[PDB]
């Protein structure tokens, strides 16, 4: 009776501790996505600069060559 | 010391001054300044000369140009009158004929003794030769011109005294010579008349009315020239005599068909050219220039006819017609003269000759003379297309640069491992990453879309500024330009009108190099990398006119000394590192090649070709096109601004021609720092210059050709030799295509390749001429050889007609002249298929040269007799005849060895000479002279020339003048060598060190002089000896002031006494010989033993008792014996008894034959026959010194003394690091099979197998040369060796007892010596 | 009776919690696998874009000093 | 024993509540990351095609181009090279075409 | 009492566990949505390689173009303004488009410099080159006559008149190339030039059934001396291929024919 209750309570406490440890590990692994996703933002940003540079090159092309 | 042959261009600007000093008129020069300039101190005193005043007292004031008169003199001058030369050249003519006939002998006796001879023998052979020599057209004229040359050379020698004036009166002509000037007085009736009544020569200087009262009651007129047209005329007469004699003699060997054109057509050609020149002046050489292309056109039509085979002839005919009509309209030719003037090219076009005769006729182009050059037209020719605007396409430049980088990468991949570790971003090459990772290099088929990626490849400095081991490149006695500060000091200060403010001191390269305080390669690199060639005082670049040529005028450039050093450095670096990825000469005849090898690299195979001119590229190069290539060349090294010196400094210069007697127009003292530009000056030179940066331009051309090959999928091979580039296209066919459509397809492929290349090259800014670029199928002419469908064509008149009794051989040395004649004879007999013409010419010239030097020597006084002051009695015919029979190795004067008719490279010059002397003495009943004729007395030679002359004898009469010049140069260096780097190499005890090294090198047992000579060249003493030799002519010995500042004694007296001693050494006989050697040479009857005894007795002081090995070799003429078997016969020698022999057999397949198969020489068959500078020399020196000595433990105690003076690495680290040809045309060699395996035990041995094949082939070719191919009654030949001159060579090594015991660590200076 | 029912309920709750933890671990493993699969290509694309931008900017800098 | 059981139950409830709050925060973070990550992709895809087409047009028109030389390239190159090292203008007199 | 409190606590724990399960399900849904939302990004790498290749091509080409020209190249406005000062191409390399400069060459209205038009003409003259006509010579009537005279011996022979007639007829019929090719082919076999001319007359279809030409002369002095030995009376129906080369008409009505 009382021994069974104590054993069940101890098992429940151990299971809760293990679940909290697993949740902490999950949170720690999840919080590593910022480092992996920052280059995505960097390459998204650099495309606009590359397009602007190419547009400037095209515009400066018509300055030199005579064309029609 | 005036020279006997032309060596400078012909300019007549100063002759305007001379006519002003005598009250005459002549407008040679286009510069008006010479019309009213002050006269020099000389050529002004002519007013006080009585001979000149009397000579010109009955002639008009007006004169005539010498351009229109040379052809008249060439035919109106013969030796009949009075000449002031007392020993006359024609006096000794019978002896010359006697000697020539005596050489038509033993040559024949030697040939019969060998076994060659000839099947057809005619009794009348000496009579025909005598009649041919006697009945020559240019004989007495040649003798008269040689008397004139002797007299004018004697006059030029003084040119400061009363003995500088001479007078000759011959029939219709009068000649007066005075100090480099000649006056010709000629009748007016010999000049062709213009339709206005005046001569053709006078219509360019005077008007018709002006040149009719000046003459009036005069019958003779005067022309004035220099003493250099006379030398030219003498050369022309000698060449014409030689060619006529050879053509006449060749008709006796082969009456049916000879390989020389004729002796009657050439005379008509000479007369037609003379008439054309006499009508048109110097302007008529534009028509003479067409002889060579017309001959090539006629050769090309001697094969299968194609629709585009005759295009070359048609284009040349149209060009010659246009040229003839454009230069004639202004001149007022008579209706009769307009028909005779069209006879040179008209005769050339209507020729009917075999290809061999046309190839021989190709060689007469300079037999009419050379034009007179002007500094205005020459510079206007190069200015018109060097400042021209160009239009370019960037895209083709892009692919050219990409192909350049591709070729560099491929060359670096093929050798030195694989790839080169690209230190560049791997994104910019999407497609070359796969090949790099797997270490593979892409093949041609799929390199069409990744070509641009090669633009993005980067690497470290693959090459290094090292491996320069020849200091003679920095001292070559060439010409440089003066500094910009004093640039007008190269003109005579009387035509200029003012004294130049600044005067230079020296202008010779060796003198400026010996005065260079701070030399070394890194100094030149620092000079170039800092852009120090842009300094204001280093920008002159003068011009200089070229030598004998038929052009309007060509020039070469000269730069100041440091810029010349930079150019030499750039060429040296670029020759070693680059210019290897672009193979220059790939000359190949696909006709005489085997299958499965040409086809393998061609992926039946048929090849066509076309030739372009690479010279016209030079002036068409612009910086806008060559900038990327130059920058890449800079990057491949560690340099920064080294390879772009020319394009940076040339446009900033002032272009002018440095002629002494006419400066640039409108030049005064005020406008000296900023001179104006006119008809002979300009500023903006934007192209290139001849010679400068040639390797880079050749590399760019190769890159363009490779780009064309990539674009047009055909296999292309490019070859460069001289100023022409040959491109060969290989077609590859799927077989079963007949034989006529295949050639048409090959020609079409070649034409389309030519069109594509023309488009690419034009897009790059360089224009080809479609009317001058032409397509060939089987006829290929390139470099030194011409082939017509795989059959080689003869060319022997190139060198045979240049034989002359007078040359430039240091103080008119007899030995040098005879050696030059012998070399010319060997080179001539190498070509063609006849023998007797060239030898008869050489025999004629040898005796005549001997007589000229005996009687008329310029180095001595007038009236001297060399043959009288030595013997004390007149020199008779027998003494000279016997002196010319002893070979030069034994101390004689014989340079024409009959054995050279078989092979050119000789195993032993002593045994062959002994055999020749014995045969000659056996022909005559004078057998008992062999012993007291070769013994002689040994001289006093140390162990310094034994190394330099391994195979030789210690006789004083066989030496030359090289040691004298070496001593002169050594003392000149000792007196003034402040170079600070020559002083380190040439220290006080250099002679002692060199002598000790050479003495130790010959201290072994047994002694091998060849190994010692081989290893001595890598020592510092070898480098010193190499540097010491840079003198080449007999004018630096006198004109160079630095040499003549040694005081002591004058060099003239020493030269005279040396000449007298040498002349006493020969022709004396039985006065310079001993009796111990003669008694020791008795009863030997073996040439090898005689040679060994002679070599042992000589060098006795050098070789006390140690035997000498590795020098004596047998004579192959005495070693073998030919049998000449026929099909239905058996060899008598093989039946008797070991009888080793060599077998020669004849094939039957002909493949090709032009024009017929009558002669075996016209046909062919299948046939078949980065390390530093001193690291190398250290490695080979160690390797050879280790290889020679092996059976000893001293192999480490002898390497160190030699190795410590060359490389920093010690021993045990270097250890870790460790052709005979023939004188016959290669036509019969393709129709013979030579078997040497029948020798059995090979008689290692004493037989050179490289020469047995040559001997057999040459014997077969000489035996059957004038006989019909179907008349040859012999099938195979046996060469049976005799057991009298064959020995075995046991293996033997070198044993060294002691060591050098000499310190060589003091040589820690740069360049050709130890490097860190 | 009541004690046994409470014990059964506690055991069922423990089983549900264990199942939830196992599902969470499986989801974490799936997320890790997805991240490992997707990390590299975006890095390569970003590097290529940055290199191209740098080289084109170098071109523009070279061309600027021409007018 | 009742007090100990009550304390244990309260602690368990608090721990589970904290775990639920952590899970909710993780859900919010994941939703925010998903929303922010895939926002500019459409613009990137739109711009890639335009950049490719404009670069292709430039490469195509590079082929139809002609260049004419002039007599000032060498002097300008020499002046730039002399300015690169020891950056003083080259000594007088002036070069061929200085401008 | 105590049992009721235990039951209530157990019920509360069950409710909180259910809420946690719902939260975990929401987490799983969010994670799977994020995982499924990355599909467009995965295919983005496919379209970037082509852009990289094209960009690298353009970079290489234009880097070489800018490096090969100098620091001073001048713009289109600068060169147009400079063209107003003489011809005088501006210093430094200028850049043009092929079509624009080509079209401006013909439109001679704004003083295009002479050097520029010569340079463009030389550059463009090489475009019309093919495998055929690469080095094919151009033959006119006068050049053909001059070539034909170089083979015949002497002067004033009737063969000169035959050559003149052949050249005139070929110029009229525009068949100089065929005549020259036939002449060269006949000469290749080794025939005499007179035989080659005879074969040309008898073989070319134009000369077949052709009336001989007539030349007016005042007297016998016009004809050359070498031609004096080949005079015949004029036949009623002469033929050029039969031997009659020309008919000489005198001022007084006399008619003579020349035959080989
Ligand atoms: Zn035998």
Q: What is the 3-state secondary structure (H, E, C) of B903-918?
A: CCCCCCHHHHHHHHHH
Q: How far apart are CA B503 and CA C49, in angstroms?
A: 66
Q: How far apart are CA B700 and CA B689, in angstroms?
A: 16
Assigned token pair, B735:
């077989």
Q: In the beta sheet, which residues pair with residue E255?
A: E249
D54 interface with E at CB cutoff 8 Å: no
For residue E67, give the chain C residue with the closest CA: C62
- Is residue B884 within 8 A of residue B851, CB to CB? The reply is no
∠ Cα B935 B941 B943 (to 5°)? 120
Distance B1148 CA to ligand 1 centre (A): 22
Name which of B463, B367, B421, B303 is nearest B1171 in CA terms: B463
Residue D62: enclosing H or E segment and its boundaries? helix D41-63
Do D67 and B684 lie within an 8 Å CB cutoff?
no
- Is residue B640 within 8 A of residue B634, CB to CB? The reply is yes
A67 interface with E at CB cutoff 8 Å: yes
Residues 6 or more apart in contact with residue B140 via CB below 8 angstroms: B78, B79, B90
Q: How far is CA A68 from CA E90, E97, E113, E124, in A?
A: 19, 8, 18, 19
Residue with tokens 């902490």: A24
CA distance B771 to chain C (A): 43
- Report the side by side order of strands in the sheet with B173-178: B165-170, B173-178, B181-187, B220-226
Residue B1133: enclosing H or E segment and its boundaries? helix B1132-1135
Resolution for this model in angstroms, one decimal place?
A: 3.0
CA distance E96 to chain D (A): 5
Class of residue C35 by CB neighbours under 10 A (exposed 0-12, middle 13-18, buried 19+): middle
**Would you say B218 is a known binding-site residue?**
no
CA distance A15 to chain C (A): 7
DSSP letter (8 states) at residue B508: B
Q: How far apart are CA E167 and CA E40, in angstroms?
A: 81
Query: How many C-beta atoms lie closer than 10 Å to residue B149's C-beta?
Result: 24
Label residue E257 left, alpha or beta by phi (over 0 means left) and psi (-120 to 50 means alpha). beta
Cα dihedral: B813, B815, B820, B823 (round 10): -170
Q: Which of residues 334-363 of B touch E (CB under 8 A)?
A: 339, 342, 345-346, 349-350
Name which of B919, B771, B944 is nearest B315 in CA terms: B771
Do A50 and C45 lie within an 8 Å CB cutoff?
no
- Is residue B379 within 8 A of residue B678, CB to CB? The reply is no
Selecting from B535, B641, B686 the residue whose C-beta is nearest the C-beta of D91 gives B535
D37 interface with A at CB cutoff 8 Å: yes
Distance B1222 CA to ligand 1 centre (A): 25
Assigned token pair, B1260:
């077969």
CA distance D94 to chain B (A): 9
Do B389 and D67 lie within an 8 Å CB cutoff?
no
Assigned token pair, B1286:
């064959």
Label residue A34 left, alpha or beta by phi (over 0 means left) and psi (-120 to 50 means alpha). alpha
Query: How many C-beta atoms lie closer than 10 Å to residue B794's C-beta?
Result: 20
Distance B1190 CA to ligand 1 centre (A): 43
Q: How far is CA B1062 from CA B346, B622, B959, in A?
A: 55, 58, 10
Query: How many C-beta atoms lie closer than 10 Å to residue B1129's C-beta?
Result: 12
Class of residue B44 by CB neighbours under 10 A (exposed 0-12, middle 13-18, buried 19+): middle
Q: How far apart are CA B1039 and CA B1103, in angstroms?
A: 42
Residue B175: enclosing H or E segment and its boundaries? strand B173-178
- Is residue B1009 within 8 A of residue B1002, CB to CB? The reply is yes
Q: How far apart are CA B1260 and CA B1233, in angstroms?
A: 11
Q: Do chains B and A touch (3 or more CB pairs under 8 A)?
A: no
In this structure, what are the phi and psi dihedrals at residue B645, rounded to the nearest 5 degrees?
-75, -40
- Is residue B196 within 8 A of residue B203, CB to CB? The reply is yes
Q: How far apart are CA B657 and CA B542, in angstroms?
A: 6
3-state secondary structure chain E: CHHHHHHHHHHHHHHHHHHHHHHHHHHHHHHHHHHHCCHHHHHHHHHHHHHHHHHHHHHHHHHHHHHHCCCCCCCHHHHHHHCCCCCCCCCCCEEECHHHHHHHHHCCCCCCCHHHHHHHHHHHCCCCCCCCCCCCCCCCHHHHHHHHHCCCCCCCCHHHHHHHHHHHHHHHHCCHHHHHHHHHHHHHCCCCHHHHHHHHHHHCHHHCCCCCCEEEECCCCCCCCHHHHCEEECCCCCCCCCCEEEEEEECCCCEEEEEC
SS3 call for B1151: coil
Residues 6 or more apart in contact with residue B11 via CB below 8 angstroms: B372, B373, B374, B375, B545, B659, B661
Residue with tokens 């495309």: A47
From chain C, pick out residues whose CB is under 8 angstroms from the CB of E3. 2
Instruction: Characterize C7-17 residue by residue with b for buried, 16 or more Cβ atoms within 10 angstroms of its Cβ, and e for exposed.
Output: eeebeebbeeb
Q: How far apart are CA B510 and CA B513, in angstroms?
A: 5
SS3 call for B176: strand
- Is residue B61 within 8 A of residue B25, CB to CB? The reply is yes
Alpha helical stretches, state H, B831-935 = 836-855, 866-871, 877-883, 909-923, 931-934
- Is residue B87 within 8 A of residue B147, CB to CB? The reply is no
CA distance C59 to chain E (A): 7
DSSP E strands, B520-655 = 542-545, 555-558, 607-613
Query: How many C-beta atoms lie closer than 10 Å to residue B10's C-beta?
Result: 20
A1 interface with E at CB cutoff 8 Å: no
Q: How far apart are CA B163 and CA B177, in angstroms?
A: 11
DSSP letter (8 states) at residue D89: P
D36 interface with E at CB cutoff 8 Å: no
**Would you say B385 is a known binding-site residue?**
no
Interface test with C, best of A3, A16, A53, A65 (most C CBs within 10 A): A53
- Is residue B685 within 8 A of residue B651, CB to CB? The reply is yes
Give the dihedral sign, CA B652/B657/B659/B665.
Answer: negative
Name which of E110, E71, E105, E112 is nearest E91 in CA terms: E71
Count: domains in chain C: 1
CA distance E28 to chain B (A): 39
- Is residue B1230 within 8 A of residue B874, CB to CB? The reply is no
For residue C47, give the chain B residue with the closest CA: B427
Do E56 and B754 lie within an 8 Å CB cutoff?
no
- Is residue B407 within 8 A of residue B444, CB to CB? The reply is no
What angle, 0 to 180 degrees and rounded to 10, lies between the N-to-C axes of helices B107-114 and B94-104?
0
Say how far residue B136 (Cα) sits from the centre of its chain. Answer: 30
What angle, 0 to 180 degrees and rounded to 10, lies between the N-to-C axes of helices B836-855 and B229-253?
140
Name the structure determination technique.
cryo-EM
**Would you say B1131 is a known binding-site residue?**
yes
CA distance E81 to chain D (A): 16
Assigned token pair, B30:
């286009």
Distance B1231 CA to ligand 1 centre (A): 21
**Would you say B653 is a known binding-site residue?**
no
What angle, 0 to 180 degrees and rounded to 10, lies between the N-to-C axes of helices E158-173 and E193-203?
40
Assigned token pair, A20:
């909290």
Q: How far apart are CA C67 and CA A63, in angstroms?
A: 9
Q: In the beta sheet, which residues pair with residue B317?
A: none
From chain E, pick out residues whose CB is under 8 angstroms from the CB of C65. 71
- Is residue E223 within 8 A of residue E164, CB to CB? The reply is no
Q: Which of residues 277-316 of B touch E (CB under 8 A)?
A: 301, 305, 307-308, 310-311, 314-315
C24 is in which domain, residue-wise? Answer: 1-67
Label residue B755 left, alpha or beta by phi (over 0 means left) and psi (-120 to 50 means alpha). alpha
Assigned token pair, B775:
């397509």
Do A66 and E97 lie within an 8 Å CB cutoff?
yes
In this structure, what are the phi and psi dihedrals at residue B186, rounded to the nearest 5 degrees?
-135, 150
Do A20 and D19 lie within an 8 Å CB cutoff?
yes
- Is residue B298 within 8 A of residue B350, CB to CB? The reply is no
Class of residue E138 by CB neighbours under 10 A (exposed 0-12, middle 13-18, buried 19+): exposed
In chain C the first and final C-alpha atoms are separated, in Å, by 98
For residue B425, give the chain C residue with the closest CA: C51
Chains with 3 or more CB pairs under 8 A to chain E: A, B, C, D
- Is residue E214 within 8 A of residue E247, CB to CB? The reply is yes
From chain A, pick out residues whose CB is under 8 angstroms from the CB of C3. 1
- Is residue B629 within 8 A of residue B404, CB to CB? The reply is yes
Q: How far apart are CA B214 and CA B208, in angstroms?
A: 11
Residue with tokens 């002196």: B883
Q: How far apart are CA B401 and CA B699, in angstroms?
A: 11
- Is residue B721 within 8 A of residue B587, CB to CB? The reply is yes
B424 interface with C at CB cutoff 8 Å: no
Q: How far apart are CA D32 and CA A9, in angstroms?
A: 39
Assigned token pair, B1234:
């030579």
From chain E, pick out residues whose CB is under 8 angstroms from the CB of B773. 135
Assigned token pair, B816:
């040098």
State the pairing for strand pair B542-545/B555-558.
Answer: antiparallel
DSSP letter (8 states) at residue B531: T
Task: Count Cα atoms within 13 angstroms, Cβ side, for B1150.
Answer: 13
Assigned token pair, B5:
């042959």
Q: How far apart are CA E24 and CA B654, in angstroms?
A: 91
CA distance C48 to chain B (A): 6
Task: Count Cα atoms within 13 angstroms, Cβ side, for B954.
Answer: 22
DSSP letter (8 states) at residue B679: T
Q: DSSP for B332-373?
A: ---TTHHHHSTTHHHHHHT----HHHHHHHTT-SSSS--PPP
Distance B1244 CA to ligand 1 centre (A): 24
- Is residue B848 within 8 A of residue B805, CB to CB? The reply is yes
Assigned token pair, B538:
């280093």
Q: How far apart are CA B954 and CA B1077, in angstroms?
A: 13
- Is residue B580 within 8 A of residue B573, CB to CB? The reply is no
Residues 6 or more apart in contact with residue B1020 via CB below 8 angstroms: B985, B1205, B1304, B1307, B1313
Say how far residue B276 (Cα) sits from the centre of its chain. Answer: 31
- If you count residue pairs, one on D and one on E, with CB atoms under 8 Å apart, how many are there? 127
Query: How many C-beta atoms lie closer than 10 Å to residue B80's C-beta?
Result: 11
For residue C16, give the chain A residue with the closest CA: A15
For residue C48, give the chain B residue with the closest CA: B427
- Is residue B513 within 8 A of residue D69, CB to CB? The reply is no
- Is residue B775 within 8 A of residue B308, CB to CB? The reply is yes
State the pairing for strand pair B173-178/B1141-1146.
Answer: unpaired
From chain D, pick out residues whose CB is under 8 angstroms from the CB of E80. none
Q: How far apart are CA B39 and CA B45, in angstroms?
A: 10
Residues 6 or more apart in contact with residue B50 via CB below 8 angstroms: none
Residues 6 or more apart in contact with residue B143 via CB below 8 angstroms: B79, B88, B89, B90, B93
State the pairing for strand pair B391-392/B220-226.
Answer: unpaired
Assigned token pair, B1044:
């003549």
For residue A44, give the chain C residue with the closest CA: C46
């Amino acid at each position: 009776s009382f021994e069974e209750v104590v054993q069940t309570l101890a098992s429940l406490a151990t299971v809760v501790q293990q679940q909290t440890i697993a949740s902490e590990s999950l949170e720690q692994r999840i919080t590593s996505l910022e480092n992996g996703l920052k280059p995505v933002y960097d390459m998204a940003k650099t495309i606009s600069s590359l397009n602007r540079v190419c547009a400037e090159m095209v515009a400066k092309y018509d300055l030199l060559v005579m064309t029609t | 010391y005036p020279d006997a042959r032309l060596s400078s261009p012909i300019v007549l600007d100063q002759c305007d001054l001379v006519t002003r000093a005598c009250g005459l008129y002549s407008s040679y020069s286009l510069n008006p300044q010479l019309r009213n300039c002050k006269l020099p101190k000389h050529i002004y005193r002519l007013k006080y000369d009585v001979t000149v005043t009397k000579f010109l007292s009955d002639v008009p004031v007006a004169t005539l140009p010498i351009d229109f008169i040379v052809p008249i003199l060439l035919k109106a001058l013969s030796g009949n009158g009075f000449c002031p030369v007392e020993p006359r050249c024609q006096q000794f003519l019978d002896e010359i004929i006697k000697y020539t006939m005596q050489d038509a002998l033993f040559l024949k006796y030697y040939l019969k003794n060998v076994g060659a001879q000839e099947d057809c023998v005619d009794d009348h052979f000496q009579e025909k030769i005598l009649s041919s020599i006697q009945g020559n057209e240019f004989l007495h004229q040649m003798f008269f011109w040689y008397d004139l040359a002797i007299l004018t050379r004697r006059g030029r020698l003084n040119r400061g005294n009363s003995r500088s004036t001479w007078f000759v009166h011959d029939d219709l002509i009068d000649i007066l010579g005075y100090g480099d000037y000649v006056f010709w007085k000629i009748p007016i009736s010999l000049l062709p008349l213009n339709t206005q009544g005046i001569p053709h020569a006078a219509m360019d200087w005077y008007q018709t009315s002006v040149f009719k009262e000046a003459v009036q009651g005069h019958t003779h007129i005067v022309s004035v020239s220099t003493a250099d047209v006379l030398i030219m005329c003498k050369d022309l007469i000698t060449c014409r005599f030689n060619t006529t004699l050879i053509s006449k003699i060749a008709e006796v060997e082969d009456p049916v068909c000879s390989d020389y054109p004729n002796f009657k057509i050439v005379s008509m050609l000479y007369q037609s050219g003379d008439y054309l020149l006499s009508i048109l002046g110097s302007d008529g050489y534009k028509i003479i220039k067409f002889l060579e292309p017309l001959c090539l056109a006629k050769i090309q039509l001697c094969s299968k006819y194609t629709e585009r085979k005759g295009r070359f002839l048609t284009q040349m005919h149209l060009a010659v017609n246009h040229t003839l009509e454009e230069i004639t309209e202004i001149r007022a030719l008579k209706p009769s003269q307009a028909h005779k003037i069209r006879e040179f090219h008209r005769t050339l076009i209507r020729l009917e000759m075999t290809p061999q005769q046309l190839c021989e006729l190709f060689s007469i182009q300079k037999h009419w003379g050379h034009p007179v050059l002007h500094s205005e037209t020459a510079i206007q020719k190069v200015k018109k297309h060097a400042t021209v605007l160009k239009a370019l396409r960037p895209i083709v430049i892009f692919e050219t640069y990409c192909v350049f980088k591709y070729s560099i990468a491929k060359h670096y991949f093929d050798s030195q491992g694989s790839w080169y570790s690209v230190t560049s971003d791997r994104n910019l090459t999407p497609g070359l990453n796969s090949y790099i990772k797997r270490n593979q290099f892409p093949p041609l088929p799929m390199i069409k879309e990744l070509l641009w990626e090669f633009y993005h490849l980067d690497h470290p400095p693959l090459f290094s500024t090292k491996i320069i081991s020849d200091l003679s490149i920095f001292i070559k006695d060439r010409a440089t330009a003066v500094e910009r500060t004093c640039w007008d000091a190269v003109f005579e200060p009387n035509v200029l009108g003012y004294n130049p403010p600044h005067k230079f001191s020296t202008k010779r390269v060796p003198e400026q190099f010996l005065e260079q305080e701070n030399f070394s390669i890194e100094n030149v690199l620092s000079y170039a990398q800092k852009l120090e060639y842009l300094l204001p005082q280093y920008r002159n670049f003068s011009f200089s006119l070229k030598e004998k040529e038929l052009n309007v005028g060509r020039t070469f450039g000269k730069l100041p000394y440091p810029t010349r050093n930079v150019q030499t450095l750039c060429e040296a670096l670029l020759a070693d590192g680059l210019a290897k990825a672009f193979p220059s000469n790939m000359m190949v005849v696909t006709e005489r090649e085997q299958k499965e090898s040409l086809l393998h690299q061609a992926s039946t195979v048929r090849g066509s070709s076309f030739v372009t001119d690479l010279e016209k590229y030079n002036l068409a190069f612009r910086y806008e096109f060559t900038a990327p290539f130059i920058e890449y060349c800079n990057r491949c090294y560690g340099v920064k601004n080294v390879f772009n010196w020319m394009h940076y400094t040339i446009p900033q210069c002032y272009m002018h021609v440095s002629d002494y007697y006419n400066p640039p127009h409108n030049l005064t003292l005020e406008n000296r720092n900023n001179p104006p530009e006119g008809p002979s000056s300009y500023r903006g030179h934007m192209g290139g210059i001849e010679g400068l940066q040639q390797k880079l331009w050749t590399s760019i051309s190769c890159a363009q050709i490779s780009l064309v090959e990539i674009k047009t999928g055909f296999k292309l091979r490019s070859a460069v030799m001289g100023d022409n580039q040959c491109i060969t296209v290989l077609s590859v066919f799927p077989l079963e295509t007949d034989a006529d459509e295949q050639e048409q397809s090959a020609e079409d492929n070649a034409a389309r390749v030519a069109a594509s290349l023309a488009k690419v090259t034009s897009a790059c800014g360089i224009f080809l001429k479609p009317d001058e670029t032409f397509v060939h199928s089987g006829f290929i002419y390139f470099g030194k050889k011409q082939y017509l469908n795989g059959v080689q064509l003869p060319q022997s008149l190139k060198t045979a007609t240049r034989m002359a009794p007078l040359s430039d051989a240091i103080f008119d040395d007899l030995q040098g002249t005879l050696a030059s004649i012998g070399t010319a004879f060997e080179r001539s007999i190498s070509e063609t298929r006849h023998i007797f013409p060239c030898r008869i010419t050489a025999a004629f010239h040898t005796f005549f040269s001997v007589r000229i030097l005996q009687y008329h020597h310029l180095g001595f006084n007038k009236g001297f007799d060399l043959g009288q002051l030595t013997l004390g009695k007149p020199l008779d015919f027998g003494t000279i005849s016997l002196a010319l029979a002893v070979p030069q190795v034994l101390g004689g004067l014989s340079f024409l060895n009959p054995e050279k008719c078989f092979y050119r490279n000789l195993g032993d010059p002593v045994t062959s000479g002994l055999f020749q002397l014995k045969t000659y003495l056996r022909m005559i009943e004078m057998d008992d002279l062999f012993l007291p004729l070769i013994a002689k007395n040994p001289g006093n030679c140390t162990a310094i020339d034994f190394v330099l002359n391994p195979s030789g004898l210690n006789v004083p009469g066989s030496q030359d003048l090289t040691s004298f010049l070496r001593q002169i140069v050594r003392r000149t260096i000792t007196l003034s060598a402040k170079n600070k780097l020559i002083n380190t190499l040439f220290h006080a005890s250099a002679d002692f060190e060199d002598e000790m090294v050479c003495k130790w090198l010959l201290s072994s047992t047994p002694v091998m002089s060849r190994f010692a000579a081989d290893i001595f060249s890598r020592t510092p003493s070898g480098k010193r000896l190499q540097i010491l030799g840079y003198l080449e002519g007999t004018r630096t010995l006198l004109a160079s002031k630095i040499i003549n500042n040694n005081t002591e004694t004058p060099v003239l007296d020493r030269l005279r006494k040396i000449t007298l001693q040498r002349w006493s050494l020969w022709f004396s006989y039985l006065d310079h010989c001993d009796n111990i050697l003669a008694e020791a040479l008795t009863q030997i009857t073996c040439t090898v033993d005689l040679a060994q005894i002679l070599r042992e007795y000589s060098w006795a002081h050098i070789l006390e008792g140690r035997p000498l090995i590795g020098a004596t070799l047998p004579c192959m003429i005495e070693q073998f014996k030919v049998v000449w078997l026929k099909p239905y016969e058996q060899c008598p020698q093989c039946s008797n008894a070991g009888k080793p022999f060599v077998s020669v057999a004849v094939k039957k397949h002909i493949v090709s034959a032009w024009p017929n198969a009558s002669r075996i020489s016209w046909t062919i068959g299948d046939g078949i026959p980065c390390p530093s500078a001193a690291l190398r020399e250290a490695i080979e020196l160690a390797s050879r010194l280790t290889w020679v000595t092996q059976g000893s433990s001293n192999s480490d105690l002898l390497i160190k003394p030699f190795l410590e003076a060359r490389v920093n690495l010690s021993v045990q680290e270097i250890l870790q690091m460790t052709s005979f040809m023939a004188n016959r045309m290669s036509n019969s060699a393709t129709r013979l099979i030579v078997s040497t395996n029948t020798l059995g035990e090979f008689s290692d041995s004493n037989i050179i197998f490289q020469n047995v094949i040559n001997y057999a082939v040459a014997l077969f070719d000489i035996k059957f040369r004038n006989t019909e191919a179907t008349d040859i009654q012999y099938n195979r030949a046996h060469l049976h060796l005799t057991k009298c001159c064959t020995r075995e060579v046991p293996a033997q090594y070198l044993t060294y007892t002691s060591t050098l015991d000499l310190d060589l660590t003091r040589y820690r200076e740069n360049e050709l010596i130890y490097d860190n």
